[PDB]
Amino acid sequence: AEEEYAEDCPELVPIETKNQEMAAVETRVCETDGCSSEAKLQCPTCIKLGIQGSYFCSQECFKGSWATHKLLHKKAKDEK
């Protein structure tokens, strides 16, 4: 054999909030489709990859959703 995947689900991170600016952005739900909870955490690997949103509600929930979330990281790119 050669090698296997090197994916990992480390401790999530808090969503960098801001002051009560006029041009603020409300509404924050768990990224998971089957989770309508308040999103407070964010995906670390996402910030690096370059994906929008990616906000979780809790680690306990992230650990699970990660099973599918990780798949999102490897989207289906095309060449036109």
Contact segment (CB under 5 A) with Zn ion among 8-16, 21-29, 54-62 equals 54-62
Long-range contacts of the stretch 57-61 (C-beta < 8 A, 24+): 57/29, 57/30, 59/11, 59/12, 61/30, 61/32, 61/35, 61/37
Shortest distance (Å) from residue 32 CB to Zn ion: 5
Quick check: 57 binds Zn ion (CB under 5 A)? yes
69 assigned binding-site residue: yes
**Choice from 37, 53, 63, 71 touching Zn ion (CB under 5 A):** 37
Quick one: 49 or 78, whose CB is closer to Zn ion? 49
| Residue 54 is a binding residue for Zn ion (CB under 5 A) | yes
Give the number of other Cβ atoms within 10 Å of residue 9's Cβ.
17
Tell me which residues in 12-31 interact with Zn ion (CB under 5 A): 30
